[PDB]
Amino acid sequence: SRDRKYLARLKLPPLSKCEALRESLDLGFEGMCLEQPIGKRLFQQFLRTHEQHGPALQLWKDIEDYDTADDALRPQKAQALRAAYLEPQAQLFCSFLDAETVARARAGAGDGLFQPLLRAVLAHLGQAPFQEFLDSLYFLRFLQWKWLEAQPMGEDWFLDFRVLGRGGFGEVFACQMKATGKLYACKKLNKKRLKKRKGYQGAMVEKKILAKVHSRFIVSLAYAFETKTDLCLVMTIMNGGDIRYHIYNVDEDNPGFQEPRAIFYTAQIVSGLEHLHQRNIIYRDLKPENVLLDDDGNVRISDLGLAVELKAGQTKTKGYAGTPGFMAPELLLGEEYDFSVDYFALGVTLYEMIAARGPFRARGEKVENKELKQRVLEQAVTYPDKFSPASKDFCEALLQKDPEKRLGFRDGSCDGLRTHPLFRDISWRQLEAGMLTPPFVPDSRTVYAKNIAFEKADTEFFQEFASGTCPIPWQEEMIETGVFGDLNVWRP
Amino acid sequence: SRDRKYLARLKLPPLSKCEALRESLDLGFEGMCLEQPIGKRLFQQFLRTHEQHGPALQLWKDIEDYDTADDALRPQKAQALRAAYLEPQAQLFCSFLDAETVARARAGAGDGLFQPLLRAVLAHLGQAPFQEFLDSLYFLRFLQWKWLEAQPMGEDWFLDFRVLGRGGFGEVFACQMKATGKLYACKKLNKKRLKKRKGYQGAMVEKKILAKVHSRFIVSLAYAFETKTDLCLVMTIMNGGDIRYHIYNVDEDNPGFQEPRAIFYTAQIVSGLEHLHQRNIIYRDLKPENVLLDDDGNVRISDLGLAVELKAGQTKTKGYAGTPGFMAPELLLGEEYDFSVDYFALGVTLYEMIAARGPFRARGEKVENKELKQRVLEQAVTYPDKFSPASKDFCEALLQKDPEKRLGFRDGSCDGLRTHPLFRDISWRQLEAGMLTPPFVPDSRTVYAKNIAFEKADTEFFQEFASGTCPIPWQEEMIETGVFGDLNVWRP
Ligand SMILES: COc1cc2c(cc1Nc1nc(Nc3ccsc3C(N)=O)c3cc[nH]c3n1)N(C(=O)CN(C)C)CCC2(C)C
Ligand SMILES: COc1cc2c(cc1Nc1nc(Nc3ccsc3C(N)=O)c3cc[nH]c3n1)N(C(=O)CN(C)C)CCC2(C)C
Ligand SMILES: [Cl-]
Ligand SMILES: [Cl-]
Ligand SMILES: [Cl-]
Ligand SMILES: [Cl-]
Ligand SMILES: [Cl-]
Ligand SMILES: [Cl-]
Ligand SMILES: [Cl-]
Ligand SMILES: [Cl-]
Ligand SMILES: [Cl-]
Ligand SMILES: [Cl-]
Ligand SMILES: [Cl-]
Ligand SMILES: [Cl-]
């Protein structure tokens, strides 16, 4: 799948070419060695080759391993961890730690056992070991990768191979990054039609939100660029398409998802919504057609074209935006609103997943926006026997017409909502890491995709929009596809 | 055999500690990338990881491989070389080369086919590829190894395990470098006895000569250091001891070497003598007791305590030095002399190897220095039937009493002497590289070794003498013993 010609442009530069990055990059520990996948990998390689750091690195790795392990393996793991690093006879005893820290980590039993230990380990690693890393070859090799990350990688680097859909949103293609073979979805916005529909500012707002979030539960933006005709956003491809299709069109006679599958998607959508709300962004368009499914069985939220970022000291907004059937009463009435709107839409979405109809409209019923609006404002929802008591109760809590009484985001988090009995069987710590096996695994639908004067103000906007490569996704791609391993070899 | 505790002091430094070496080292291409084993290895690793340099490196390696191959394999090698790098369809065609150079290298057939090609390859490598190496991680890793090479590695680093011999020369021990396990011979000079026998200047002259030669046919000096009681020279151990022992004491009834074995040692001693004479050094003590044998079957000259380096514009010297029986007439008469003296001693040594007696004295005969001196000056040598015509003729040529008529060093080399029919079966190019199988392989004799106020002028001399680690031998040891491979790993 890799193409030779583009793979050959991924060459590490001479060191002298990296002297300007060295001045201008943020070189803090958390930002470089914890948050950037290449930074982390290179930091850990430095630790592994410096025997004095062996215990700190192996303890670091063993805590991450513990944090994502199946419930049945945690006793034996927390025993092996303690014996290797914490007990007085431990072969890899971590003597940079406080006696208190070692004490507490040897006691304790519940969730987040070792989270305090981990903070201590990362705190230690950010002092002398990090300073030694900055004076090593490994740090320079990080600057070389960062120089590469910053090079031009525009339309030429992507091969379009299938049309996924066209409409007012632009056109979306399945495409392949030529050097690595990685598959992506590319959304293309026609520059002329965009100017004439005065959509510059909306498009920019969407791109910005996508660039600044980084969640496994939200489609990722990996590249933003321009062509002569289009502005282009290269993002995670979700091979299953939208979940609405799956609710109705897979078992046509008996549509709807089984509860475990519905619950698992809800949990992933809640994780996505929390990520946005913690960054002061309101999504405003949650519905089944904008929740996408991949062929591992996981979902992400997509279509961030109606989303708003709240400004400094802003807790509410106004503005009529959404999809009829999913907009909360407070929005339909023209009031100010906050993150609450997305929780009502969540309620509606879960209802549909289980019932294969919405709470206000029978399957296939045709309702004009006025008749729908008055149903959302006045109609009490009923629940068929198809709903368990926990799914009914969760749904009632989200469908509260008064946002003051609705379940949602409280005290900076969704942790309140995570405690509802609906989610009693979800291991959030494995969900967060992508390590919880989905209750259902679908087939890919990529084969159902069919084959393939501006002013200076227009120019400057396009070029600002075309900000290029996003660091974190690019580092992921390089590691995942094996390119990092191949180009980072010291002696074959 | 490696010891953990000393191995642990071989740690590569932080980069900032190498900034002063970077200013003060000679960083020329020939000196760093061709002559220093670690420099070369790191240069070749840089070439191997930069695909554009692949052809130059593989051609470089294939020429060295050709230069040392058994005679029967050279046709097929020179064919495979031409097809890979030189013909218009060659997969690894070397397009930095001139069309003339490629032409000549495709023609030709004799000895030194590709020597002009090799000069062209190394000339090319010393331009842009070398400049790219200096701007790479590989060059910095070279500075790190050079910093290590310069660290204190005195008496503590060596474990003495056997006494090889004691006398007026000091004491010689078999010893082991603790970090690497490498075995060496260590010669120790007692500081008090040395001062009192006024031997400071002689000892210094010897150390200096050993440090500045680098030949596979001369014992190598690897470390020079002091203790509270001794000055110490750590050098190649030669496990067989001196060849005099082997002439007489292995087949006691029928002593002497077979001609092929004698010829092979002579060829190696000539290679050693040429190395000295090309550096304007006269050995002055060649004899069987100072030619040492190792258990691969190869010999080196040792005991450089009488050697002289001629000064600028000096072609002759005077001074009565040597061993009775091996000193040339011109020296015995008190005349000026040059490199010719060592060729007479060669004559004597070869005579003894074949006859198991000297040319002037029967086996076991006792002759006072006066009666011997007059025999060397007046007696015509005779040759038993034991001598082939070629060995007789070579011996006659070296035993000429008139140094003007003696075979020797002419026009900067021994190439004249190399053409004598005696050496018709020696492949000099494999001999020079250590790649000619010896006609005889002996057993090691290490088990016959038995177990274990100064002025400020004295102080300054000892510390000048104790110059520490010699770069080239140290880099060899690191590579040979596997330490280089182990510490130079980038990702285990
Ligand atoms: C192999 O992948 C697919 C195949 C299909 C779809 C979507 C995808 N995948 C996909 N589709 C995307 N968006 C998309 C596809 C059709 S319209 C559309 C959009 N308006 O964003 C995105 C945006 C980020 N990542 C994406 N991944 N389709 C849909 O999900 C249609 N719904 C959005 C309404 C079109 C149907 C097929 C099977 C081709
Ligand atoms: C396992 O190694 C040996 C063992 C023995 C000898 C020499 C060596 N090896 C040796 N011997 C060396 N020198 C040496 C050993 C005894 S005296 C002496 C010297 N005066 O330099 C050197 C100097 C550089 N490298 C050396 N290697 N011996 C001799 O070669 C004695 N002749 C020089 C006269 C002593 C005998 C044994 C077997 C112990
Ligand atoms: Cl690692
Ligand atoms: Cl390093
Ligand atoms: Cl299902
Ligand atoms: Cl509805
Ligand atoms: Cl209804
Ligand atoms: Cl959990
Ligand atoms: Cl190599
Ligand atoms: Cl490099
Ligand atoms: Cl023999
Ligand atoms: Cl004699
Ligand atoms: Cl005689
Ligand atoms: Cl030859």
User: Where are the domains positioned within chain B?
Assistant: 1-150+444-492, 151-241, 242-443
Number of H helices, E strands in chain A: 23, 11
**What CATH architecture is B151-241?**
2-Layer Sandwich (3.30)
Q: Are A103 and A120 in contact (CB under 8 A)?
A: no
**B47: nearest CA partner in chain A:** A491
- In the PDB record, what is the listed experimental method? X-ray
Q: Is B27 helix (H, G, I), strand (E, B) or coil?
A: coil
Which residue is associated with the tokens 């013909």? B87
CA distance B396 to B382: 9
Closest CA to A487 of B91, B266, B113, B49: B49
- Ramachandran sector of residue B322 (left: φ over 0; alpha: ψ -120 to 50; beta: rest): left
Q: Which two tokens stand for residue B474?
A: 């140290």
* Single-letter amino acid, residue B50: H
Contacts 24+ apart (CB under 8 A), B409-414: B409/B273, B409/B274, B409/B277, B409/B339, B409/B343, B412/B278, B413/B274, B413/B278, B414/B270, B414/B271, B414/B273, B414/B274, B414/B277
- Coil, helix or strand at residue B172: strand
Q: Which two tokens stand for residue B236?
A: 């190649």
Query: What is the CB neighbour count within 10 angstroms for residue B366?
Result: 6
Strand-pairing partners, residue A236, are: A184
| CB nearest to A135's CB, from B16, B136, B491 | B16
Say if residues A392 and A402 touch (Cβ distance below 8 Å). Answer: no
Which letter does DSSP use for residue A219 in this model?
Answer: P
> 């005893």: which residue's tokens?
A93
Class of residue B198 by CB neighbours under 10 A (exposed 0-12, middle 13-18, buried 19+): exposed
Angle at B421 between CA B418 and CA B423, to 5 degrees: 50
State the ligand closest to the CA atom of A399. 6
| Catalytic site positions of B | 285
What does the DSSP 8-state code read for residue B185? E
Mutate to test the pocket of ligand 2, among B172, B236, B244, B287 (most ligand atoms within 8 A of CB): B172
Contact B438, B296 (CB under 8 A): yes
CB-nearest partner of A15 from B48, B136, B141: B136
Are B468 and B223 in contact by the 8 Å Cβ rule? The answer is yes
| Contact state of B15 with A490 under an 8 Å Cβ cutoff | no
Return phi, psi of residue B139, to 5°.
Answer: -65, -45
Cα–Cα distance list, A338 to A219, A269, A302, A307 (Å): 23, 18, 20, 12
Quick check: B128 contacting A, CB < 8 Å? no
Measured CA angle at A77 (ends A75, A79), to 5 deg: 70
Tell me which residue has tokens 């979700």. A238
The answer to whether residues B133 and B1 touch, using CB atoms and an 8 Å cutoff, is no
Query: In whole angstroms, what is the distance from residue A440 CA to residue A269 CA?
Result: 16
Integer Cα distance of B345 and B86 in angstroms = 48
Report which ligand 1 atom has the smallest distance to the Cα of A449. Answer: 39
Q: Which of B45, B141, B492 sits opposite A137 (nearest CB)?
A: B141
| Cα radius of gyration rounded to whole Å, chain B | 25
Contact call for A137 and B140, based on CB within 8 A: yes
Number of Cβ within a 10 Å radius of residue A136: 22
CA distance A146 to A129: 21
Q: Do B49 and A492 touch (CB under 8 A)?
A: yes
At B82, the amino acid letter reads R
**Dihedral, CA atoms, A482, A483, A484, A490, nearest 10 degrees?**
100
Cβ of A222 below 6 Å from ligand 1: no
B4 touches chain A (CB under 8 A): no
- Residues B445, B241 contacting (CB under 8 angstroms): yes
Residue B241 bridge partners (DSSP): B293
A contacts of B57 (beta carbons < 8 Å):
none
Is the CB of residue A489 less than 8 Å away from at least one CB of chain B? yes
Can you give the resolution of this entry in Å?
Answer: 1.9
Ligand 1 pocket check for A237: Cβ under 6 Å: yes
- CA pair distance B54, B37, nearest whole angstrom: 20
How is A22-66 classified by DSSP, letter by letter?
A: HHHS---HIIIIITSHHHHHHHHHHHHTSGGGHHHHHHHHHHHHH
Q: Positive or negative CA dihedral for A251, A253, A259, A263?
A: positive
Please tell me the residue having the least CA distance from ligand 2 atom 32.
B242
Is A136 close to B16, i.e. CB distance below 8 A? no
- A291-293 sheet: strands from edge to edge: A241-242, A291-293, A299-301
Largest CA distance in chain B: 77
- In order of A129, A371, B123, the CA distances from A125 in angstroms are 5, 61, 47
CB distance A92 to A84 below 8 Å? yes
Rounded Cα–Cα distance for residues B253 and B231 (Å): 42
Tokens of A277: 């709300």
For A199-323, strand residue ranges (E) read: 221-226, 230-236, 241-242, 281-282, 291-293, 299-301, 308-309
| In contact, A268 and A333? CB cutoff 8 Å | no
On whether the CB atoms of residues B115 and B101 are closer than 8 A, the answer is: no
Residues of B in contact with A492 (CB under 8 A): 48-49
CATH number for the region B1-150+444-492 comes to 1.10.167.10
Binding positions of A are 164-172, 187, 236-238, 303
Q: Whose CA is nearest to atom 28 of ligand 1?
A: A241
Nearest residue by C-alpha to atom 21 in ligand 1: A303
Number of Cβ atoms within 10 Å of the Cβ of B426? 18
Packed helices B37-48 and B54-67: angle between N→C axes, nearest 10 degrees: 130
**Distance from C-alpha of B292 to C-alpha of B282, rounded to nearest angstrom:** 19
Q: Which of A169, A171, A172 to mutate to test the pocket of ligand 1 (most atoms within 8 A of CB)?
A: A172
Rounded-to-integer distance, Cα B268 and Cα B262, Å? 10
Tokens 């064919």 belong to which residue?
B79
Residue type present at position A70: D
Q: Is B15 on the interface with A (CB under 8 A)?
A: yes
Give dist(CA B43, CA B53) in Å, integer.
11
- Report yes or no: B15 and A135 within 8 Å, Cβ to Cβ: yes
| Four-CA torsion A138, A141, A142, A144, nearest 10 degrees | 170
Q: How far is CA A62 from the centre of its chain?
A: 24
Pocket test for ligand 1, best of A164, A183, A218, A234 (most atoms within 8 A of CB): A164
A489 contact residues in B (CB cutoff 8 A): 49, 490
Distance A360 CA to ligand 7 centre (A): 4
Q: Atom of ligand 2 at shortest distance to CA of B163? A: 39
Angle at CA of residue B162, ends B188 and B212, nearest 5°: 40
CB contact under 8 A, A135 and B48: no
Q: Report the candidate in B89, B80, B28, B32 with the shortest Cα–Cα distance to residue B59.
A: B80
Is residue B131 within 8 A of residue B43, CB to CB? The reply is: no
d(C-alpha A424, C-alpha A263), whole Å? 10
Which one of A15, A45, A140 has the shortest CB-CB distance to B491? A45
B217, two tokens: 């046919």
User: Which residue out of A230, A285, A338, A342 is catalytically annotated?
Assistant: A285
Q: In a 10 Å sphere around its CB, with 0-12 CB exposed, 13-18 middle and 19+ buried, how is residue B40 labelled?
A: middle
Nearest to A492 among B15, B48, B140 (CB): B48
- Helix, strand, coil share of chain B (percent; to 5): 50, 10, 40
Nearest to B319 by CA among B282, B372, B374, B288: B282
Please, which residues bridge with residue A241 across strands? A293
Q: Which of A140, A82, B98 is nearest to B106 (CA)?
A: B98
Q: What ligand 1 atom has the least distance to the C-alpha of A164?
A: 39
**A242-443: what fold?**
Transferase(Phosphotransferase); domain 1 (1.10.510)
> In chain A, what is the straight-line distance between the N-terminal and C-terminal CA atoms, in Å?
23
Separation between Cα atoms, residue B264 and residue B299, nearest integer Å: 9
Q: What is the least distance, in Å, from the CA of B45 to any CA of chain A?
A: 6
Are the beta carbons of B324 and B369 closer than 8 angstroms? yes
Q: Tell me the chain A residues in contact with residue B15 when contact means C-beta distances shorter than 8 Å.
A: 135-137
Q: Where are the alpha helices (DSSP H) in A150-250?
A: 191-196, 200-212, 243-248
Determine whether the interchain pair A490/B135 forms a contact, defined as Cβ–Cβ distance below 8 Å: no
Say how many residues make up chain A: 492
- Chain B CB contacts of A488 under 8 Å are 491
Backbone torsions φ then ψ of B422, nearest 5 degrees: -45, -40
> What is the distance between the alpha carbons of residues B196 and B198, in angstroms, rounded to a whole number?
5
Instruction: Write the CA distances from A35 to A44, A434, A475, integer angstroms.
Output: 13, 17, 11
Whose tokens are 């056997």? That residue is: B162
Ligand 2 atom with the shortest distance to the CA of B303: 21
Q: Indicate which of B137, B141, B145 best probes the interface with A, i.e. most A CBs within 10 Å of its own CB.
A: B137
DSSP string, B339-361: THHHHHHHHHHHHHHHHSSBTTB
Distance between CA atoms of A49 and B12, rounded to whole angstroms?
A: 11
Q: Which chain B residues have a beta carbon less than 8 Å from that of A140? A: 137, 140
CB atoms within 10 A of CB B60: 19
Contact A298, A220 (CB under 8 A): no
